[PDB]
């Protein structure tokens, strides 16, 4: 309960968190676009790293929605 006290620069901390989340979203979105661009290998990739690509994808969008929901809740 001691840590629940508000503080002295709460708006400063809110802006700091906003910038951190915005930079994280930009980095994650750029990385997702890079992986999507690299996914066009012009091959079927059956029994290959294709399923690794979709599992990396599914690991990416989950963090994207987590970042979005925390940004909205902030």
């Amino acid at each position: 309960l001691k840590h629940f006290i508000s503080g002295f620069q709460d708006a400063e901390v809110i802006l700091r968190l906003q910038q951190e989340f915005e930079e994280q979203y930009q980095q994650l979105h750029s990385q997702l676009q890079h992986l999507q661009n690299q996914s066009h290998l012009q091959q079927q990739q059956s029994q290959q790293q294709q399923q690794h690509l979709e599992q990396q994808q599914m690991k990416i969008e989950k963090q994207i929605r987590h970042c979005q929901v925390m940004q909205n809740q902030l």
Binding site: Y25, H29, L32, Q36, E61, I64, Q68
Partner: protein, 85 residues
């Protein structure tokens, strides 16, 4: 910016609510089509070189959607439009 916003929020609300491709096309046609008339003011000059690239990149997703007819083809485009929003 205001009519782009007014198209965008209505399209997002309709997509979240009822998921009808006809009304998606209806809500997405005007903003997509009005960007290729050429500039007439400094506001248009500032708008076309600052925001056109991301929207045209997301337009590839809908171009693929119109030939694939699968739901997952629009999630990345909707994320791009969410950043635009």
């Amino acid at each position: 910016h205001e009519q782009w916003y007014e198209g965008l929020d209505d399209a997002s609300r309709q997509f979240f609510g009822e998921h009808n491709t006809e009304k998606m096309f209806a809500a997405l046609e005007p903003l997509y089509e009005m960007l290729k008339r050429g500039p007439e003011t400094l506001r248009e000059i500032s708008f076309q070189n600052s925001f056109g690239r991301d929207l045209n990149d997301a337009y590839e997703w809908l171009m693929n959607y119109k030939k694939s007819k699968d739901v997952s083809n629009l999630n990345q485009a909707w994320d791009i439009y969410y950043n635009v929003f």
